[PDB]
Design a protein around this ligand. Sequence first.
Ligand code: HEC
Ligand code: HEC
Ligand code: HEC
Ligand code: HEC
Ligand code: HEC
Ligand code: HEC
Ligand code: HEC
Ligand code: HEC
Ligand code: HEC
Ligand code: HEC
Ligand code: HEC
Ligand code: HEC
Ligand code: HEC
Ligand code: HEC
Ligand SMILES: [Ca+2]
Ligand SMILES: [Ca+2]
Ligand SMILES: [Ca+2]
Ligand SMILES: [Ca+2]
Ligand SMILES: [Ca+2]
Ligand SMILES: [Ca+2]
Ligand code: NA
Lengths: 104, 518, 519, 102
Amino acid sequence: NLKPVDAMQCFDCHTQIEDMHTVGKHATVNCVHCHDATEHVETASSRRMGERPVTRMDLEACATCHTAQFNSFVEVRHESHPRLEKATPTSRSPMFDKLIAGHG
Amino acid sequence: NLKPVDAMQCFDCHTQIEDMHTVGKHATVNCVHCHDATEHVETASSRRMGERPVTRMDLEACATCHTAQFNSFVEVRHESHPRLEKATPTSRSPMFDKLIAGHGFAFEHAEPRSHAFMLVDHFVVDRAYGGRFQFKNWQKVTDGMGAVRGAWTVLTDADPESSDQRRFLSQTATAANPVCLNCKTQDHILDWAYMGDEHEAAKWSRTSEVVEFARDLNHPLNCFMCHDPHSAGPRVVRDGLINAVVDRGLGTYPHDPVKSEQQGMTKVTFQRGREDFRAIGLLDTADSNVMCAQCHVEYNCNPGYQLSDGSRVGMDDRRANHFFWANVFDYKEAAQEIDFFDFRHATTGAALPKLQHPEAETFWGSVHERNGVACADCHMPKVQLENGKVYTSHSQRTPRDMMGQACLNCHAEWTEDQALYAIDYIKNYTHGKIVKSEYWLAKMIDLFPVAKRAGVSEDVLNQARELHYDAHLYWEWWTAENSVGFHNPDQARESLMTSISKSKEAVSLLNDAIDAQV
Amino acid sequence: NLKPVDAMQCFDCHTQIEDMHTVGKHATVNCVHCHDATEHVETASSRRMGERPVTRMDLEACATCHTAQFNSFVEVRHESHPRLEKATPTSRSPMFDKLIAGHGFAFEHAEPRSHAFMLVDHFVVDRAYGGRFQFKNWQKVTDGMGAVRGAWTVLTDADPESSDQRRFLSQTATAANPVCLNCKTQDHILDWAYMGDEHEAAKWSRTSEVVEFARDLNHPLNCFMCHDPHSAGPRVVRDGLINAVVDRGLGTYPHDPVKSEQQGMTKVTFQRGREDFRAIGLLDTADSNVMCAQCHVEYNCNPGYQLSDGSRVGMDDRRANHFFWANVFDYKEAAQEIDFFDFRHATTGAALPKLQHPEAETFWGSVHERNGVACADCHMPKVQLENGKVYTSHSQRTPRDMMGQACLNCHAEWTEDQALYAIDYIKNYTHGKIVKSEYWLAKMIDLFPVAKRAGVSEDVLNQARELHYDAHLYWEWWTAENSVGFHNPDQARESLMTSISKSKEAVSLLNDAIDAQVA
Amino acid sequence: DQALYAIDYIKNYTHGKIVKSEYWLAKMIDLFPVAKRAGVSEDVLNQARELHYDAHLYWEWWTAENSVGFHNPDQARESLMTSISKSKEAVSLLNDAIDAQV
Ligand code: HEC
Ligand code: HEC
Ligand code: HEC
Ligand code: HEC
Ligand code: HEC
Ligand code: HEC
Ligand code: HEC
Ligand code: HEC
Ligand code: HEC
Ligand code: HEC
Ligand code: HEC
Ligand code: HEC
Ligand code: HEC
Ligand code: HEC
Ligand SMILES: [Ca+2]
Ligand SMILES: [Ca+2]
Ligand SMILES: [Ca+2]
Ligand SMILES: [Ca+2]
Ligand SMILES: [Ca+2]
Ligand SMILES: [Ca+2]
Ligand code: NA
């Protein structure tokens, strides 16, 4: 289970983040949802990063509080034909090979 | 009403039949269901046939006891578009006419449709009999049951008084020969010696007048092509397949000697006048891969030419009835092995192979084949019933129509739409490479006239012709093969990339040579 | 794998079978498909059976060569609501409990469902075996193929160590007897003498312990009930039907002697030793009206009482296995002919008949019957295939599921919705009259205790009881009959109006009598 | 479905012949610049132009006509086969003439 960190400790060094986080609609969302910064906090200075914190870039970081948007995003439209070459008579550019010759 | 005959009387002379019939699941099925042998019994000796018994080859001989399988077989899949030419921008081979120029398939090559129509479609296609045979009218194209009852119930002959192959319509060809019929019907099973060799007991052979032969034939894909009528056990009857698997020792799975042994074939020969006449291949298991490989293979069923010297190889030659039994990457070697090619390209002059529907050879080594999956699992699955006796569907068709049974019972992780999407990914990707291969082939082909007219040397032209053979092979395999890559996606990809590579090489060769003449 | 036997050797002693088998469409079907006679052939003479050969009665004996018919037969129509009690406001007979009080059907009477279930449903219904037999669990109710494979593959017996009929659950009855089984199975066809009379060669009879009999039976509606296994020709095997049509001379169409002659039945008897034992009725034509009338008729299959003196008529009596073979307006006379009634009404004390599903006798005289239409035309039509060999559907069900082939091929002037609307007009009208008949019957019934307690005379009560017999008959025929009038709408209408008329007469009689005693 | 299938049989077959007719027309058309530039005679070019009229007519009737052969399948077939025949004749004429100039 996630344990919240003291964001005020972060904000001592991260004024830009403070200015954004405390005003917006994620003011109640703790940093631990996306960052593991324990060793970073131990080693950073006001101007040097020290140990780099872990930052989650995965979309499931948002999906625990926004499952509807996540699930809508990840839906696969099976009707969007996959791996369908455009340089074919039934697709977008029947004469693409002749016209694009020289390009990757 | 049928009256049974005393089979014991038959068995006195027919020991092979006795051995098969008394042991299998047709031990109780009386001969009269399929044979009228009264005058035969009166006149035969132990070694001479006497009067020939009547043998039913119609599929309704099986339908009285196996109506479910019959009715499933004869169903017409209306969604399988009929008489749809492949050489069109919306079909399999948009540039087919340019690429196949010089071959008879330029006259017409339609997509396949339901099995009921195979014999009539063979008779009426523009490339086969010069337009001699036609449906009685355009309504009859729908009549699958009629075609099954007999081709001549639904077709006409433009000139019953002549038996020569000739053109009745201007843009037709006369490519049909007797070998073709072996993959359309086995009505001739007792009238055709093994391989279509000349034989005193055979009415028909490779060298017969095909129009006369045609007139003797009625039924498509007889039920007994896969099931021995005497034992009811699984078999093949197609000579070319038996020849590859057994005579040439290649095995049922040439890439896998273990599977070949487990799922093998035993050649059984029947004689006339104590001379070998015809043969069947009894299967160890009910292996649809091998059953379907009676027809869904690359073959010779046609005259051609020798690679070595260009001399004609006629219908009289054994090579005119040949199963290569080789995958795409072994094919060129297999064609060299018999010293054969099909046609010379009309524009390039290259000796080329003509490929035909190599589903069986393509399926080899695929993930599904390696996992023990077989054609029937996807194309003629068991029927699932809430309450009922299970039987095997005999409507051989795309799994799209029965995805639950064909795919999803195995692929429990997928919905139908997901499985379809996976098929389409492969087919879409493969088709794109087919199209690109055709683009490059066409680019090469179009350089030949320019090169010849610019005075490029025969040596360079011949180098380009050698590249054309490979560029053609590694492309046409895939327009011929019906799965658009699904049966072996990695192989299709590697092949088509090879085709493109070969064409590009030839294009560079010819352009450079033209530019040097200028 | 089956190995054929030498049928000619069998025929040296079985000339009767030879004469059927060699001429029909099963001449090539070897005996081994249905008989295991090896030890029999080793021990028999033409005059001594020796070891009894085994005869297969399972439907899969036919399914090997006739899978399409078998599979169509065993299909379960899920839309045919299962275990749906008729005595509810949303079913056939909203006031059934009041009206049938004193009869075992009060314990449970569900609507029919698909044929596959007939034997199991007979075994498990609350009125039949005191709740002795149950599905193994509630999942098994779906398993039509399992029921066809055999009842005892899907059912349990509460006490395999006893064979008496008794109540295992409190609100059950033990109405089952061996006659019932004749309309559920013919597994016992070689073990039951004609009519279930006592016979030295019969293992089972009308007087058998039905629980013991039940345990020996497995398959529903055997294929050979309509098709002779030797000739493959059309027949019936049901004794009661052969008895009405042939023995009693009533014919296959009692109201039409011409049609009776054209579409008749020939009784064929089989002996055990020198004595007649069992019989079948070979049909002149493949007449589904008569095939289906093996079961879809009004019958006695039960003990009862005599109208004359009230004495008990037990299962030992021939009357306990009886096809009345009479339309609704001839029934009372037919019951008088055999001096029989079923039960005394619990409230009114009236001697009453119990009616059961008289589809065959109702269909007679209807516009469709007079036009040569038969049950199969609407309920098991030929399959229509774009490409294929035609066969006859054996899924006997409402035409609503196959209106193109059941109705509209004949009624080219109608759309499906129009044909359905015509069905519904008749059913809605008929049901309204059933409901009104029940209202008036209930009104009469409720007056009986009031009249009795007011001191109304027995003479007046007996007059009202005589009216009750008729009010009941002319109502119950139609809750019993499954078409809700469609099979004969004019007859239903006339009958139900008669019921109401009779009840109204009884209500007036009793009310006036009560009022006079007062108050 | 059967009736639709019968329509599609005709339309599919006719369309294939339309496509083939166009293939052959295009092959002929593309030879004209090559022939003119190789110095093929006006007499040969005019012979080919006469064949073009017929090749065109017996093709274009069917792209113009909206039933894709259904209205008269035998006529479409005969016409389109004639178109192809005419184009093939012209192709042979022009190729031979070009090859003779070279
Ligand atoms: C729960 C601990 C959350 C996490 C993890 C994420 N978000 Fe969030 N988000 C949360 C709340 C309580 C709210 C406010 C809801 C309200 O309407 O009051 C939000 C809001 C958003 C919004 C809307 C902002 C706006 O309209 O100004 C967005 C676009 C949003 N959240 C996105 C988002 C992303 C992309 C996340 C992963 C990086 C994410 N949220 C995580 C709660 C939580
Ligand atoms: C009835 C008189 C039959 C005729 C005509 C045909 N078959 Fe048959 N077949 C019949 C029976 C009684 C059985 C055995 C059923 C069982 O499962 O016990 C069979 C079996 C088959 C099989 C299955 C064989 C096996 O699994 O080993 C096949 C493949 C088969 N029959 C095919 C078949 C063919 C192709 C027929 C026409 C040539 C044919 N049968 C006729 C009964 C009858
Ligand atoms: C030779 C006698 C064949 C055998 C054995 C098998 N097939 Fe076949 N198949 C054959 C032909 C000549 C055709 C074309 C028929 C026509 O009139 O065009 C086909 C077609 C198919 C198809 C396409 C069906 C469709 O709906 O379009 C499929 C899916 C197919 N074949 C599969 C298949 C299977 C799985 C086989 C083994 C059970 C099999 N065929 C055998 C010729 C022959
Ligand atoms: C078995 C090795 C075959 C030989 C010999 C011949 N054909 Fe065939 N044919 C075969 C199959 C498996 C299929 C279906 C798959 C496919 O890709 O088409 C076909 C199909 C046809 C068709 C219909 C499709 C078409 O090309 O228009 C026709 C008209 C046809 N075959 C004709 C034909 C001719 C003329 C043959 C001898 C020259 C011939 N076939 C042989 C299998 C086999
Ligand atoms: C090869 C292309 C076949 C043709 C031609 C026919 N059948 Fe077939 N049949 C085939 C397979 C692959 C199977 C399943 C084998 C397995 O065990 O998986 C079958 C099966 C049968 C059976 C057995 C019962 C069943 O499984 O349905 C029967 C009775 C049968 N086939 C009959 C039959 C008929 C009547 C045919 C002509 C209409 C027919 N088969 C052709 C393959 C092939
Ligand atoms: C499942 C794992 C399959 C196996 C085993 C076999 N085939 Fe197949 N085939 C499969 C698919 C997904 C497709 C594409 C179908 C689609 O609708 O996109 C095919 C296609 C064919 C066809 C053409 C069918 C048509 O387009 O109507 C044929 C003739 C065919 N396959 C034959 C065939 C043979 C003979 C097989 C055993 C050697 C075989 N297939 C196996 C899936 C599967
Ligand atoms: C004479 C030597 C017999 C031969 C040979 C066969 N059967 Fe028989 N069978 C015979 C007798 C005397 C009887 C009893 C008749 C009587 O008076 O009751 C029978 C009976 C049968 C039955 C019915 C058994 C029953 O359940 O009541 C059957 C199904 C039967 N026999 C079958 C049969 C078969 C299939 C034979 C050839 C393999 C056969 N019998 C030979 C006398 C003789
Ligand atoms: C295969 C060994 C069979 C067995 C087992 C059963 N039947 Fe049969 N039946 C079989 C054949 C070959 C035929 C003739 C088919 C034809 O049209 O040529 C039949 C026919 C019937 C019929 C139709 C009879 C008629 O129209 O006169 C029926 C009603 C029938 N069979 C029923 C039936 C029953 C009920 C079976 C189990 C007791 C049975 N058959 C088994 C082949 C075989
Ligand atoms: C006695 C052996 C019967 C014969 C012969 C026929 N039917 Fe029947 N039918 C019978 C029973 C015991 C039942 C009820 C089964 C149950 O388990 O509840 C039925 C039911 C029907 C139905 C209703 C089916 C439904 O979907 O609800 C119909 C339509 C029906 N029966 C028709 C019918 C026909 C037309 C017959 C002659 C071909 C026929 N039955 C014969 C008992 C018996
Ligand atoms: C797994 C989590 C289940 C869910 C979801 C459903 N059922 Fe079930 N059911 C389950 C088990 C393990 C069993 C017992 C199996 C056994 O043979 O021991 C059952 C049983 C039933 C029954 C029979 C009940 C009885 O008293 O005999 C019925 C009628 C049944 N299940 C139906 C059913 C329905 C309709 C469900 C969806 C609402 C359902 N079950 C869900 C396991 C699970
Ligand atoms: C033939 C003349 C029959 C006799 C004897 C018995 N039943 Fe029956 N039963 C028969 C038919 C045609 C039907 C279906 C039509 C209908 O109206 O139900 C039935 C149905 C049943 C059912 C299911 C419906 C129900 O009432 O719950 C059961 C449980 C049933 N039959 C039992 C049963 C008993 C106990 C019998 C002897 C007292 C009996 N049936 C005899 C036809 C015939
Ligand atoms: C009476 C209630 C039937 C029972 C029980 C079975 N069948 Fe039947 N069958 C019945 C009818 C009214 C008909 C049509 C007769 C007509 O000529 O109109 C049939 C027909 C058949 C046939 C013949 C082929 C066909 O028309 O489909 C067969 C082979 C057949 N029936 C088989 C069969 C089987 C296997 C049964 C048990 C599952 C069975 N029938 C029962 C009436 C009745
Ligand atoms: C068409 C002209 C019919 C004839 C001939 C027979 N029946 Fe019928 N039946 C018919 C209809 C329109 C209905 C009502 C069905 C509905 O869904 O509303 C019925 C009903 C039955 C039932 C009950 C079916 C059910 O409710 O599931 C049975 C058991 C039944 N019919 C039996 C039966 C018999 C035995 C027939 C010949 C004597 C008969 N029907 C003929 C239409 C027609
Ligand atoms: C009656 C007013 C018709 C209309 C509407 C349609 N068709 Fe027709 N068609 C009709 C006749 C009398 C015939 C000739 C019958 C004969 O055998 O002599 C036909 C023929 C066809 C054909 C065959 C064409 C040919 O051989 O050249 C086809 C393919 C056909 N009909 C199809 C068809 C379609 C699809 C229709 C709806 C658009 C249609 N027809 C209407 C009579 C009538
Ligand atoms: Ca197809
Ligand atoms: Ca080839
Ligand atoms: Ca160009
Ligand atoms: Ca019902
Ligand atoms: Ca009764
Ligand atoms: Ca009250
Ligand atoms: Na068997």
